[PDB]
Amino acid sequence: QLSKQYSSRDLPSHTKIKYRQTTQDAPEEVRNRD
Amino acid sequence: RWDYQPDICKDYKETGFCGFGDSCKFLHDRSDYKHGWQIERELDEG
Amino acid sequence: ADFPILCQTCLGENPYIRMTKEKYGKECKICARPFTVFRWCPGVRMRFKKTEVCQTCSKLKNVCQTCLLDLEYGLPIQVRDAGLSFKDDMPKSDVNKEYYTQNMEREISNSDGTRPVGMLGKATSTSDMLLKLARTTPYYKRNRPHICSFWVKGECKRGEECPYRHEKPTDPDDPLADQNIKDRYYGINDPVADKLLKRASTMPRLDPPEDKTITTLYVGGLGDTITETDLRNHFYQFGEIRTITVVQRQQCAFIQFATRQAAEVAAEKSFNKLIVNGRRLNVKWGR
Amino acid sequence: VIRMVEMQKDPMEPPRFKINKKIPRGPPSPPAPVMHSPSRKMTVKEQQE
Amino acid sequence: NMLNLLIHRKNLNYLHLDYNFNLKPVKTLTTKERKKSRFGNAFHLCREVLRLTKLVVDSHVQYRLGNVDAFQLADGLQYIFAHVGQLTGMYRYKYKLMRQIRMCKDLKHLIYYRFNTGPVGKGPGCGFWAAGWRVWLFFMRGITPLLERWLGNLLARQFEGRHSKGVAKTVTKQRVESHFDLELRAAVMHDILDMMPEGIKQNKARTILQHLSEAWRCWKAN
RNA sequence: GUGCUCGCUUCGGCAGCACAUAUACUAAAAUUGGAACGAUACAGAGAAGAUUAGCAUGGCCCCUGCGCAAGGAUGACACGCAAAUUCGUGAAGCGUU
RNA sequence: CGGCCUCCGAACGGUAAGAGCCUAGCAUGUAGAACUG
Ligand SMILES: O=P(O)(O)O[C@H]1[C@@H](OP(=O)(O)O)[C@@H](OP(=O)(O)O)[C@@H](OP(=O)(O)O)[C@@H](OP(=O)(O)O)[C@H]1OP(=O)(O)O
Ligand SMILES: [Mg+2]
Ligand SMILES: [Mg+2]
Ligand SMILES: [Mg+2]
Ligand SMILES: [Mg+2]
Ligand SMILES: [Mg+2]
Ligand SMILES: [Zn+2]
């Protein structure tokens, strides 16, 4: 029972996740740090 | 087009009295009179 | 669904059956909600059928999702239930029925897809009454079309392609005419079911005698392929027998019993159907 | 051995069924057992405090 | 046909949509009908876009029926596109149209004040309708997904039903004080009157809440 | 049905080869059942003395709206209020005399 | 050698709410269909 109604806000948007890069603070450097 | 519904404060028209008084955003008018479509329809059915 | 649930009659004859599927095709008049619809080509120039009840609405009472009759016997559900002495509490009103259907699907979700839920197994003692009212061959008149109302007034000008059997229409004065599908499913006053009741009431069964001390039972139509120990093994562990007279000058028998209810069990279950080595014996209480 | 075919859905077809049906919520679960410490009734003094 | 089916499926017998796509009532409508028969920017934006295309098609029908002319057809088309403002009345349903309407005026100015460079007169004999045609076509490029979404939702709500069951409405500007109090007095009822009781009986939470509201009135009155 | 057999073999057919391969909610119907917010009429408007603004909570109530916005008499309904509770009634049960 | 020229309109908020009542529509187009010695 899945309706066909819909929303302006549920349109696709921000569809890639920004992954935390090498310089910012990756879980790797958190693995290291003192 | 034809601008169909005139603005006839129906409380006034039927009972001579509108609770809003001066601010009634409609036309204080007790005049019975054949409308813009009544006559058309009756004549064509005639 | 995986596929429908219907009897052989509704199911078809050709080895290769052709049925088209539509997901969420229409509304089970029982579960009231969307179901899948599989549509099967019944027979040559025979009306294409379609699945007509939710598969859960089916596993509820264990009947045919198209043919509407039980899947083991194949008699009206009122009948089959009563032949198991079965008494279902299925709710009827709108809100009550929706709540019932919802929790029913929840409870059936915990099943393995093999057999109907609930008393449908604890009533599985299919009584010889049901066995005997059960039809034998595929009454395949079901897949013949309607009465081509044109062809009933004359009008069916499409040649032989009248979409419906151009015969004489049944006088709806017959109780076998207007049985509302919902009522037939609810076991609600099915006149065809009352006809099956009258038939299984008039159908021959063994008669009881008057005095308790008539514990001699005459079995008519024996023949000379029978033994006294074979008459025994017919009526021996079904209680205790006291004596037996195998009348070979009249081709009958007479079991004097040691338990009256045991005699009743053996004989009444044996009425015309105690078929050992193929001879139609008649179980009665002797003189 | 049976051939299933999927029947076309018509594109210009509105929804078919009244979805918005309200009923109460179904009965919950088999209640858990209350594995509580021994509970103490309070003095009437405490009660008035 | 589509729009009439919509009305008459909604059971609005007292309204009738005529052939230039004006909606006109055939009675005097009571309140309940005045209200039940209201329509929104989806319905009216289609109505008026259909009216624009019908005016275009019917200028072409006049020409091919043979009444007018090639030149009269071109000038009429130029008119229609420049004057969309006073033929249709779409601006009232998407007031962002006046982007387009100002664009067609500006074109109208450019084309004309270069068109009459010589003896040519400042009168009706100018149909050069490439530009406004472009304009309204881009407007349509944009409006088709919007209207598809709005009309899908209108139809869905028409055939399934409106879901008043799981709405979950935001807290906007008029429910800010009401909501602060829902949650203040919920928090109280969680907070002590059920997690520092030992008033075993029935913890009189309904009365500790009455204190709380009188403590507030007394703070406010000093 | 279309062609070709070096087919009989005449220009009649017969035949063989090839090629060509499974439509369809069968129905012009006949049914069968509910609403039209329309008449009809009855009805007949929150809080505090009067006259009135609203915003919410609850849910087998919805309506208009694209709407998670807004409106529909604050949309309607919510109405006994139970409730313990203050004294005694009693019964059950454990312990003392 | 100088050129500088905003705007523009529709809806809700406004002419109660109701139960009954009665009848078009609008939907359905289905399922089935009988037996013996
Ligand atoms: O109604 P509009 O589309 O805005 O245009 C008309 C008109 O032209 P159209 O009626 O044929 O479009 C005039 O232009 P002429 O035909 O007289 O050349 C006039 O121009 P002026 O005002 O400069 O005299 C002006 O059009 P424009 O936008 O070019 O001014 C006027 O509309 P407005 O006077 O409101 O602009
Ligand atoms: Mg008051
Ligand atoms: Mg509101
Ligand atoms: Mg008000
Ligand atoms: Mg108001
Ligand atoms: Mg409210
Ligand atoms: Zn007034």
Ligand 1 neighbours by CB, cut-off 6 Å: E 82-83, 105, 108-109, 112, 122
Interface mutation target, options A5, A7, A8, A10, chain E, most CBs of E under 10 Å: A5
User: Letter for the amino acid at C154?
Assistant: G
Taking residue B31's Cβ as centre, other Cβ atoms within 10 Å add up to 7
CA distances from E73 to C133, C270, E84, E124 (A): 83, 99, 16, 12
Give backbone dihedrals phi and psi of E108, rounded to 5 degrees, phi first.
Answer: -50, -40
- Sheet strand arrangement including C34-40: C49-50, C34-40, C17-27, D2-6
Nearest CA distance, D12 vs chain A (angstrom): 13
* Class of the CATH domain delimited by C216-285: alpha beta
Cα Rg of chain D (Å, integer): 29
Paired sense of beta strands C34-40 and C17-27, if any: antiparallel
d(CA E50, CA E44) in angstroms, rounded, equals 10
Task: Enter the resolution in angstroms.
Answer: 4.2
> By the 8 A CB rule, do C255 and C231 touch?
yes
3-state secondary structure of E141: helix
Residue nearest F24 (alpha carbon to C1'):
C48
Which bases of chain F are contacted by protein, using any atom under 7 A from a CB?
Answer: 24-30, 35-39, 52, 54-57, 59-73, 84-85
Question: Three-class SS of residue C235?
Answer: coil
DSSP characters for B1-46?
Answer: -------B-HHHHHHS--SSTT--SSB--------TTHHHHHHHH-
Separation of B20 CA from ligand 2 center, angstroms?
Answer: 20
What is d(CA C33, CA C43) in angstroms, rounded to the nearest whole number? 29
Closest residue in chain E to residue D47, using alpha carbons only: E199
CA distance B42 to B27: 26
Q: How far is the CA of B26 from the centre of ligand 7 (A)?
A: 6
How long, in residues, is chain D?
49
Q: Residue type at E47?
A: R
Cβ distance E200 to D17 less than 8 Å, yes or no, reads no
Name the strands in the sheet holding C282-283, side by side, starting at the edge strand that comes first in the sequence: C241-244, C252-257, C216-220, C282-283
How far A1 CA lies from chain D's nearest CA (Å)?
7
C251 CA, F9 C1': separation in Å? 81
Helices (H), E66-192: 70-82, 84-87, 98-115, 130-159, 176-191
- Closest alpha carbon to C134 in C56, C175, C211, C73: C73
Q: Dump the DSSP string for C156-176.
A: --STT--SS--SPPP-TTSTT
What pairs with residue C244 in β-bridges?
Answer: C255
Nearest nucleotide (C1') to alpha carbon of D10: F25
Residue nearest to nucleotide F63 (CA to C1'): E36
User: Do the beta carbons of residue C11 and residue C19 sit within 8 Å?
Assistant: no
**Ligand 7 centre distance from Cα of residue C273 (Å):** 93
Q: DSSP 3-state assignment of C86?
A: coil
Distance B19 CA to ligand 5 centre (A): 15
CA E42, CA E47: separation in Å to the nearest integer?
A: 9
DSSP, res E160: T
Tell me how close the Cα of B1 comes to any Cα of chain E, in angstroms.
Answer: 6
- Out of E112, E113, E115, E135, mutate this one to test ligand 1's pocket (max ligand atoms within 8 Å of CB): namely E112
User: C285: closest CA among C212, C202, C204?
Assistant: C212
Q: Indicate the pairing of strand C241-244 with strand D2-6.
A: unpaired
Q: CA B2, CA E217: separation in Å to the nearest integer?
A: 58
Residues 4-33, chain D, CB closer than 7 Å to nucleic strand F: 7, 22-24
Three-class DSSP category at E137: helix
Residue nearest to atom 22 of ligand 1 (CA): E109
How would you class A4 by CB atoms within 10 Å of its CB: exposed for 0-12, middle for 13-18, buried for 19 or more? middle
Q: Which 11-40 residues of chain E approach strand F with CB closer than 7 Å?
A: 11-14, 30-33, 35-36, 38-40
Entry field: residues in chain B:
46
